[PDB]
């Protein structure tokens, strides 16, 4: 398959990237170095993951080493919820740039559509456990993102975890200067998101699928939850193609014209997960994988569900 997808800013984005959530700081430098050595050219990062400095060490080494040119890398980061106010967005982006050892990002996302009270705590809580919102509206945060483009800090801007009505809000913003280039959302056979994906694709937005393996290392996993990697129906599709279950799970979103960002810190798996450009799933296989949808989510958070902009009360 074609290795990059054209964005609405005219740039090309690699359809396979390396995820970094939960990658320990002591292991993520080696993971990113190995990824770049074996061909990855897209890295998905975020301030809230607490490992951007170590990701940046890897990127800098490979650039210094002349393993890859900066123009060939596609580095993504994300604005955390406690930085949605106008006067905090530039400094948040600049901190991420400083940590990653870069003078621009390829893509900067609003991480969640919910703004939180600014401060040191990533999840500021009231005395009863609810997250404390900010009275920032999303549209104002988008205008601050647009300024980053115009200042040269970021080449493209986008959104993450926005539902159908929030995407439409952004698209209908008075005075909109830059459309979102990407919406990064959870997507896998148990949460297939057909409705949201068709909406975004109809509007020219590229969708990135996160948690494509079902995030088996999520901190809130419960021993009895569904497990994609162990699903014998997916194992059977994999066996028919002489591929691993992970390889099928990564190829699946690629054939839906999605970008996909599997995470690993294991060098062998980082390699395995990149070898997905030499087989095709049939239409029948694709439809079968889609049939496994159960509307199950990795990423949701009870403490945030009363926030006015919490995204997952809506159908899509």
Ligand X SMILES: NC(=O)C1=CN([C@@H]2O[C@H](COP(=O)(O)OP(=O)(O)OC[C@H]3O[C@@H](n4cnc5c(N)ncnc54)[C@H](OP(=O)(O)O)[C@@H]3O)[C@@H](O)[C@H]2O)C=CC1
Contact status: 299 vs ligand LDT (CB under 6 A): yes
Tokens, residue 165: 């009505």
Least distance to ligand X, CB of residue 297, Å = 10
Rounded Cα distance between 181 and 93, Å, is 17
Question: Which of 14, 19, 113, 115: binder of ligand X (CB under 6 A)?
Answer: 19
Please confirm, yes or no, whether 49 is among the known catalytic residues: yes
Q: Check binding of 263 to ligand X (CB under 6 A).
A: yes
Q: Which residues contact 195 (CB under 8 A, 6 or more apart)?
A: 164, 315, 316
**Is 269 annotated for ligand binding?**
yes
Count the Cβ atoms, other than its own, within 10 Å of residue 9: 19
Report the nearest approach of ligand LDT to the CB of residue 189 (Å). Answer: 20
Can you list the alpha helix ranges (DSSP code H) found in the chain? 25-38, 52-64, 86-100, 138-150, 164-171, 194-202, 232-241, 245-254, 267-272, 283-290
Strand pairing class (182-186; 4-6):
unpaired
Stretch that binds ligand X, among 34-42, 164-172, 258-266, 275-283 (CB under 6 A): 258-266
Angle at 283 between CA 280 and CA 285, to 5 degrees: 75
Question: Could you tell me the smallest distance in angstroms from the CB atom of residue 219 to ligand X?
Answer: 10
- 44 is an interface residue for ligand X by CB under 6 A: yes
Give 12's DSSP letter.
E
**Residues in 265-304 at the binding interface with ligand X, rule: CB under 6 A:** 265-266, 269, 272-273, 298-299
* Alpha carbons 40 and 62: distance in angstroms, whole number: 12
Residue 263 annotated as lining a ligand binding site: yes
Residues in 240-259 at the binding interface with ligand LDT, rule: CB under 6 A = none
CA dist 61 to 25, 42, 58, 100, Å? Answer: 16, 16, 5, 11
Among 112, 190, 252, 316, binds ligand LDT (CB under 6 A): 112
Smallest distance from the beta carbon of 112 to ligand LDT, in angstroms? 4
Which residues partner with 185 through β-bridges? Answer: 209
Binding range to ligand X, per CB under 6 A, among 140-148, 164-172, 191-199, 204-212: 204-212
First to last CA, the chain: 29
Q: Is position 264 annotated in a ligand binding site?
A: yes
> Contact with ligand LDT (CB under 6 A): which of 7, 31, 49, 156?
49
Burial 273-312 (b: 16+ CB within 10 A, else e): bbebeeeebeeebbebbeebeeebebbeeeebeebebbbb
Residues in touch with ligand LDT (CB under 6 A): 21, 46, 48-49, 112, 114, 299-301, 304
Q: Tell me the binding residues.
A: 10-19, 111, 211-273
Could you list the active site residues?
A: 49
Residue set of the binding site for NADP(+)? 10-19, 211-273
Q: Using CB under 6 A, list all residues that contact ligand X.
A: 19-22, 44, 111, 160-161, 184, 210-217, 229, 244, 246, 261-266, 269, 272-273, 298-299
């Amino acid at each position: 398959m074609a290795s990059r997808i054209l964005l609405n800013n005219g740039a090309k984005m690699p359809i396979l990237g390396l995820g970094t959530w939960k990658s320990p700081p002591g292991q993520v430098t080696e993971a990113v170095k190995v990824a770049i050595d074996v061909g990855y050219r897209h890295i998905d990062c975020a301030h809230v993951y607490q490992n951007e400095n170590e990701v940046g060490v890897a990127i800098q080494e490979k650039l210094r080493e002349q393993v890859v040119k900066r123009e060939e890398l596609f580095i993504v980061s994300k604005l955390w919820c406690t930085y949605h106010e106008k006067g905090l967005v530039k400094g948040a982006c600049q901190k991420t740039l400083s940590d990653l050892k870069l003078d621009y990002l390829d893509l900067y996302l609003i991480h969640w559509p919910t703004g939180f009270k600014p401060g040191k705590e990533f999840f500021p809580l009231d005395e009863s456990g609810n997250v404390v919102p900010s009275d920032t509206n999303i549209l104002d945060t988008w205008a601050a993102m647009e300024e980053l483009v115009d200042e040269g800090l970021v080449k493209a801007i986008g959104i993450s975890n926005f539902n159908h009505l929030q995407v439409e809000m952004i698209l209908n913003k008075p005075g909109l200067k830059y459309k979102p280039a990407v919406n990064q959302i959870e997507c896998h056979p148990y949460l297939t998101q057909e409705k949201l994906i068709q909406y975004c694709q109809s509007k020219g937005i590229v969708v990135t699928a996160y948690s494509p393996l079902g995030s088996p290392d999520r901190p809130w996993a419960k021993p009895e939850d569904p497990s994609l990697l162990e699903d014998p129906r997916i194992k059977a599709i994999a066996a028919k193609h002489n591929k691993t279950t992970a390889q099928v799970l990564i190829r699946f979103p690629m054939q839906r014209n999605l970008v996909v960002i599997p995470k690993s810190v294991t060098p062998e798996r980082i390699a395995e997960n990149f070898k997905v450009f030499d087989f095709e799933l049939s239409s029948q296989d694709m439809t079968t994988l889609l049939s496994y949808n159960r509307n199950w989510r990795v990423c949701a958070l009870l403490s945030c569900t009363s926030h006015k902009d919490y995204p997952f009360h809506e159908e899509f």
